[model samples]
Target: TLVASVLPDLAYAELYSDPPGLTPLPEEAPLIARSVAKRRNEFITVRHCARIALDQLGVPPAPILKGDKGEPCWPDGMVGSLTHCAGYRGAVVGRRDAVRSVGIDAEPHDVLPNGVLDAISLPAERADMPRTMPAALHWDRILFCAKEATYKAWFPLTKRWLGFEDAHITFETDSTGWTGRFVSRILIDGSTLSGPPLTTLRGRWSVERGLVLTAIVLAG
Candidate 1:
């Protein structure tokens, strides 16, 4: 029955403050986490997402814990990633020992305020931006989310920091799925992580629950 190395999950609801959760103040955490309760939703979403992902892999849906550096401790024979945003939650699961890494992301499609885009996008990318875009929109958010997913997929294998500009992305969007490329020269040291470069690691994003959800798989 084993057919693939990757599985994905998507969430379609919002988080309610029913269970007691930790909320570090803005001064304690990054301004982003401090700015919205939605940021903390990932803690709960990741738990649920992992459970669902594992279930699809014929594994029991056991809860996961965050270890040092925020890695998820999944049940035996499973490797995965979890992500959630304003209105979406998702996960990707694969064979424990076979999967090199995985990453998932969710983002909202809205107009970002002034100066936000300038800070994240490189000059060349900005120059290539479609001139018809509205000034209020932030294309870099997509890029940022993609990079975050890439790092999430990359970190477990490389244990190295991949700068925002370290990779270039080219995506082709369609009605059913998206195909994207993360063009980077960074090498994945096999001796360190037991895998090779997942250069063709692909991602798919779609609009669901009024949110954009993306999931990627990195295979060994």
Candidate 2:
């Protein structure tokens, strides 16, 4: 649902149900073996969804390898993201010509562990955020997920780390349910190829079925 809402132009998007017992391709088996059972299952299931996404784009399915920073390495001319949580695993892919980059994240709709909010948030962010929210919304977790998605979009462009302090985020929501926009202003300076100066990345966030989802896209 998040994919449909945020990445409607994607050629393919797939979400796996719980107990993902995926069989990895031969090339991916070694990577699968290196992880514990739970992690291995998530990894394989996510990649399986990724291949399906690629197929929908008319690309051949290949082993989705891990990059230097543990991100997925997609095929040439493709841009996409993958995410998995306790009960969900998903992938979204599109042609590079259509989408310059994409970032997606999913987390349980619950408070982060004690002090994690402080650990991941800047002082300004903490001060600006509300101390409380309705039972259905977790602002802290939404911020955390937004940062993860931001970094995913940032990395492929800058090939550098975008720490929590590197950006300032503000959320906008109406009186409806937990669905709104989050805008991230880049605090650092840089450029990606011939692209415009890095300034802001806007994204959408939604809370549904006890899950928090955030997604960002950079147009080509």
Candidate 3:
């Protein structure tokens, strides 16, 4: 059996090295080729982390699969989210029947290009951004990453398109922690629903070694 003491990060590498003989894409797939390295790293790290977490729980690593929406498929009775950023990585595993959904994401801590905020972030959010925080890059990445995590959590359950503009995230930062609030209308599986508000779906971000990582978890 795989040992729980195995570092999730290391297990992630092994998965990629000995992939289940998945077919390679056409060489003409520019986007696929360009992203192969970083994307593989993220997938590998997430897979390993999940294995380690399961090993700790004395569970077997079953045939892992992913849905068309990119959510990880846990064994029959499990639910969870996996994520790996340029700097750090992590995963959250839960019982399938007890939990409704899961989501996670990671991003490096680097200054966003000018206008990126305008492109992706809501206007009101910029005003609330922490100018005096350790770094503005943290603020930007957290916002982006949180949105990604929130959507990831939302997608599998809803299977609908939710854009950045569909929701607004508000947060407060202090020496100890950061909290986020979401405000917007969301459709789950084509149905408008009042579930967890942005306030309920939350995340935290921090920067170390020139990378910033953030994740949000939303569960039923």
Candidate 4:
């Protein structure tokens, strides 16, 4: 489903559930050694997904690690992101020179827990949650997907923090039923900045197969 919006050069791997016999990279096992069964499975499954994409980029299979911020540390020349929730796991990867960054996330086709709509979103977004789509989709949760994907894309380049209120989000639905696009207009100010400031980010969202997926790729 993400392929429609993602570039052909960028590789994406997803699974409704981990493939049979899915195994964790020995190097990454320590990260989830004492975690619950659920956490261990997801940690291993996501890294497996990442390796598939990395191989497609002509890179050798290697244990993907977590950076200081808990972001995936790909091979030196790779840029990628990984996200998993209950029944879904996804990874997208590309050559470092192929793009500025890559971000992708997935969530169940379910609404945010009650008051979460107000806490994690701007007032305008909460008030203007449009429902004129081709289907009765969960627009609130979709916005959440956009926010998280935006942060994933932003952090890699800036290594900075982006609060939920920092980006004003807007959405557009395509005629193809469950597919659409979104734009995240950043509203940030501070004493000093980390790197080049980003004022805007555009991305795509999909609501299908019982999940809402968002992906953003910045051209290099």
lDDT score of model 1? 0.54
User: Each candidate: how many clashes?
Assistant: 0, 0, 6, 0
Error of model 2, residue 195, in angstroms: 2.6
lDDT of 3 at 191: 44
Taking all chains together, the TM-score of candidate 1 against the true structure is 0.67
Instruction: Give the candidate order by descending lDDT.
Output: 4, 2, 3, 1
lDDT of 2: 0.80
Per-residue lDDT over 27-102 for candidate 3, one digit per residue giving the tens place of the 0 to 100 score: 2133235666667555555566676665654568554566676566776656566766544556666554445556
TM-score for each candidate, following the candidate numbering: 0.67, 0.90, 0.67, 0.92
What is the TM-score ranking, best to worst? Answer: 4, 2, 3, 1
Q: Model 1: runs farther than 4 Å from truth?
A: 1-42, 129-138, 175-192, 198-200
Which residue pairs of candidate 4 clash?
Answer: none
lDDT of 4 at 164: 95
**What is the C-alpha lDDT profile of model 2 across 26-110, one tens digit per residue?**
9988886767878888887888888988998888989888888888888989988889998778787768887878889989889
In candidate 2, residue 3 scores what lDDT?
57
Cα RMSD for candidates in order: 7.1, 2.2, 7.2, 2.3
Pick by lDDT: which candidate is best? Answer: 4
What local distance difference test score does each model get? 0.54, 0.80, 0.54, 0.81
Q: Output the TM-score of candidate 3.
A: 0.67
- Candidate 2's displacement at residue 173, Å, is 1.1
- Scored by TM-score, the top model is 4
